[PDB]
């Protein structure tokens, strides 16, 4: 009943990022993805697509400004028969279900 209710689930991520600067101005920048899949056969997972641009600059000797912008696109799905007692589901199921 354990293999009937739980699986080995793959997780994958990757990133590309640029940094550098010059006189009085700096920038950070990255893009990346993330995809983790839950080990419960009852479906659960989390995945995001990430972007970030960080920036700051000395305008003159009296003013200096900055800005860092981020954002993503994410699919979260949460398995939620857990923490509750149901006849053939969850870790409670892998133990209680007759063989």
């Amino acid at each position: 009943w354990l293999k009937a209710l739980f699986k080995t689930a793959p997780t994958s991520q990757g990133d590309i990022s640029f940094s550098g600067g010059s006189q009085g101005t700096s920038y950070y920048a990255s893009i990346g993805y993330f995809d983790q899949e839950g080990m419960a056969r009852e479906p659960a997972n989390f995945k995001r697509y990430s972007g970030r641009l960080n920036f700051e600059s000395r305008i003159n000797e009296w003013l200096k400004v900055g800005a860092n912008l981020s954002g993503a696109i994410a699919n979260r799905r949460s398995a939620d028969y857990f923490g509750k007692y149901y006849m053939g589901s969850g870790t409670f199921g892998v133990l209680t279900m007759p063989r």
Partner: peptide, 13 residues
């Protein structure tokens, strides 16, 4: 079914 035999209820989370 839904075997609520005991099910002592979580008080801390």
């Amino acid at each position: 079914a839904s075997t609520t035999g005991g099910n002592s209820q979580r008080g801390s989370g």
